[PDB]
């Protein structure tokens, strides 16, 4: 209702770098809020695409940002009569970026990896990897939990069980408040999908450069399955954390599997042991239900609510005709040990091919009325098709069907304005939480400030 669309701030990265594909607020030890931006097609120093990360300090005028440096050199290790290989070409560094305390985790989901042993190999495959950085000290660590040293043959001999070769770890990511980093690897277990968890502190303390295969004893990976419903389900395409069992001592994970059960799609709520607590099934095949997930309390009862996005949902229209618009599903959490029921509200896009619900961002209490609010992205929405982000204020009844405010893309066609979103943080220190919107097609980020 009160995000200022006139007074915007534009941050820009280099051409073709997809600056703004991912972003987050980062807060230094002093308290100063900055914006971390992922740019997964940034050219490395040798003119080859590696991707990159930028750390923007808050300015009204915005502009260019400094690059947060990472090692972009490939590595080889001849150890244990094997040959370990890392490949950072086209790795997509910054495809996801998340901040926790004084640490920034930027992932390269398509970093490849191989192991050679005589005439045999494990196969050169995208295991993914995440680069952890602590800017105020300079410390760097990495985390790449799907790397293995098992040869091609042994997988064949074991009917491809526990095959982590195609994980794409860090495809999605979130950190708990305690400091557990959770990564989505939708290519895990032969495209079934998996989650990898590990304390940020333990990732730092077990990492040394050049080792390539090391143990993080505290880490916890999800499980492989022979259930056909899970095959090619991309479990971990999106990921989030919240409180859904009523026990503050434990943390619950929300995982998106958008092609689960023959492209029906699904979102699951799990405990930290990866036991299923509830499963939300998709409504319509190929709608990509689970592309986006958001956790926040919108009705002011203290219990976190769930928001799932299905950006390719086709709505029914006159004369049996379907129209791809996108849909967001709101699930309010009830009291006591009770399951999440049917959706309390369905929000459906209006523009054809608009991909409404491609991103859903908790804004916090935007208008400071007691209820939390959210923003939903329609990256090709609006009459022009340029893109559109829609603000929805919360209330006792859940959310409003009618949006309180609509932000139109200030960038040209193709920008993907709204593909990334983040809020619930006061960047200018005026007492109201603000919103950052990425437009990777345009290589830019737009900051909107909340006013009284």
């Amino acid at each position: 209702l009160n995000l200022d669309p006139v007074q915007l701030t534009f941050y820009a990265g280099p051409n073709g770098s997809q600056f703004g594909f991912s972003l987050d607020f980062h807060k230094d030890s002093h308290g100063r809020v900055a914006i971390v931006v992922g740019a997964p097609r940034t050219l490395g120093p040798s003119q080859e695409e590696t991707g990159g990360v930028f750390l923007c300090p808050w300015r009204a005028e915005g502009g260019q940002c400094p690059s947060l440096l990472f090692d972009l050199r490939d590595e080889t290790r001849n150890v244990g009569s094997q040959t370990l290989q890392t490949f950072k070409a086209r790795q997509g560094l910054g495809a996801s970026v998340v901040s926790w305390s004084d640490v920034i985790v930027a992932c390269a989901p398509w970093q490849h990896w191989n192991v050679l042993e005589k005439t045999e190999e494990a196969e050169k495959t995208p295991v993914g990897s995440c680069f952890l950085a602590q800017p105020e000290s300079g410390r760097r660590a990495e985390y790449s939990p799907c790397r293995g040293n098992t040869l091609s043959r042994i997988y064949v001999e074991n009917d491809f069980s526990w095959d982590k070769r195609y994980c794409e770890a860090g495809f999605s990511s979130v950190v708990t408040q305690a400091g557990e980093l959770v990564l989505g690897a939708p290519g895990g277990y032969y495209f079934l999908g998996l989650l990898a968890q590990a304390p940020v502190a333990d990732i730092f303390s077990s990492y040394r450069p050049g080792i390539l295969l090391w143990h993080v004893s505290s880490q916890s990976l999800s499980f492989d399955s022979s259930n056909p419903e899970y095959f090619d389900g991309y479990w971990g395409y999106s990921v989030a954390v919240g409180e859904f069992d009523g026990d503050l001592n434990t943390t619950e994970y929300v995982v998106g599997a958008p092609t689960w059960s023959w492209t029906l799609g699904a979102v699951e709520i799990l405990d930290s042991y990866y036991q299923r607590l509830h499963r939300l099934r998709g409504e319509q095949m190929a709608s990509y239900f689970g592309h986006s997930v958001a956790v926040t309390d919108v009705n002011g009862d203290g219990r976190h609510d769930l928001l799932v996005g299905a950006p390719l949902y086709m709505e029914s229209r006159a004369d049996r005709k379907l129209a791809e618009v996108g849909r967001v599903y709101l699930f309010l959490q009830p009291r006591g040990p009770h399951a999440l029921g049917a959706p309390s509200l369905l929000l459906t896009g209006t523009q054809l091919y608009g991909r409404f619900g491609s991103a859903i961002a908790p804004l916090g209490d935007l208008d400071r009325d007691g209820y939390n609010d959210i923003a939903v992205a329609a990256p090709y929405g609006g009459p022009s098709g340029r893109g559109q982000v829609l603000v929805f204020l919360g209330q006792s009844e859940g959310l409003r069907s009618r949006p309180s405010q609509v932000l139109d893309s200030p960038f040209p066609t193709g920008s993907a304005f709204g593909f990334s979103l983040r809020g619930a943080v006061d960047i200018d220190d005026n007492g109201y939480p603000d919103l950052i919107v990425g437009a990777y097609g345009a290589n830019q980020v737009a900051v909107y400030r909340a006013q009284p």
Partner: antibody
Framework: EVQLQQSGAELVKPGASVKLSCTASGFNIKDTYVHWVKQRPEQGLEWIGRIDPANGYTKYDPKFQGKATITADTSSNTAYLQLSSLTSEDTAVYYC????????????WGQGTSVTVSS | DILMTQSPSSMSVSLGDTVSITCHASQGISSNIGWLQQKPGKSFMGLIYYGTNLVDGVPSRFSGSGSGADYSLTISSLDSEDFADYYCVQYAQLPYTFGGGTKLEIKR
């Protein structure tokens, strides 16, 4: 606290077999490779082999192929070394080892098990 | 197999000294070397892994160095506790192979 707890001293007869054990404490045996090493005063340290208890796959020095069989059991967090066809040369102190972080390293050791072959 | 030749086999040194123990491989082993300690009548304790990295809890006075086929362990300022046997081990290739050892002895 990581700690490898090996079985006590063995006094065995030549020709027989013996089976030494190595039990994890403060961690799970399937967490890393587990190695076995031989020590003698004159001949020094010799690497016998390793096992990956998660799947049972093993590797051996040709010198100990056939004599030494390494196994492991995750239900009891224990790895084992079995030496068949005991000879005087098998009289040694036997250690189990695992790495700290590096997959291929040899950082944590058991207290050792003394094996004496005699008639 | 890779032959690891450790030198010297023993040295007579004093408290506060800085000593070094060299270890030569029969071929290049790209820092894939460990350093072990065995105190009299006790078991083994890891000191260095992958050439230069100290094992958790190992005192700063220990340090590794080298490359290719030639590596060194350096204890700076000897403690009474440091009079023990020390071994190198390579893991560039299976089978893993050990040096002969070095015994630090009290000079008198």
């Amino acid at each position: 606290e990581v700690q490898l707890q090996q079985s006590g001293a063995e006094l065995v007869k030549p020709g027989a077999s013996v089976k030494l054990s190595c039990t994890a404490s403060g961690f799970n045996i399937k967490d890393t490779y587990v190695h076995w090493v031989k020590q003698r005063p004159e001949q020094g340290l010799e690497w016998i082999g390793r096992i990956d208890p998660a799947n049972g796959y093993t590797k051996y020095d040709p010198k100990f192929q056939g004599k030494a069989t390494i196994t492991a059991d995750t239900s009891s967090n224990t790895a084992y070394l079995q030496l068949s066809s005991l000879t005087s040369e098998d009289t040694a102190v036997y250690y189990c080892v695992r790495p700290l972080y590096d997959y291929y390293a040899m950082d944590y050791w058991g207290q050792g098990t003394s094996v004496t072959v005699s008639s | 197999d890779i032959l690891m030749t450790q030198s010297p086999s023993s040295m007579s040194v004093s408290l506060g000294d800085t000593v070094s123990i060299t270890c030569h491989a029969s071929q290049g082993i790209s820092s894939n070397i460990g350093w072990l300690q065995q105190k009299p009548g006790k078991s083994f304790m890891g000191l260095i892994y992958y050439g230069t990295n100290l094992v958790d809890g190992v005192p700063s006075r220990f340090s590794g160095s080298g490359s290719g086929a030639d590596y060194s362990l350096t204890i700076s300022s000897l403690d009474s506790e440091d009079f023990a046997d020390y071994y190198c081990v390579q893991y560039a290739q299976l089978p893993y192979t050990f040096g002969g050892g070095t015994k630090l002895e009290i000079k008198r």
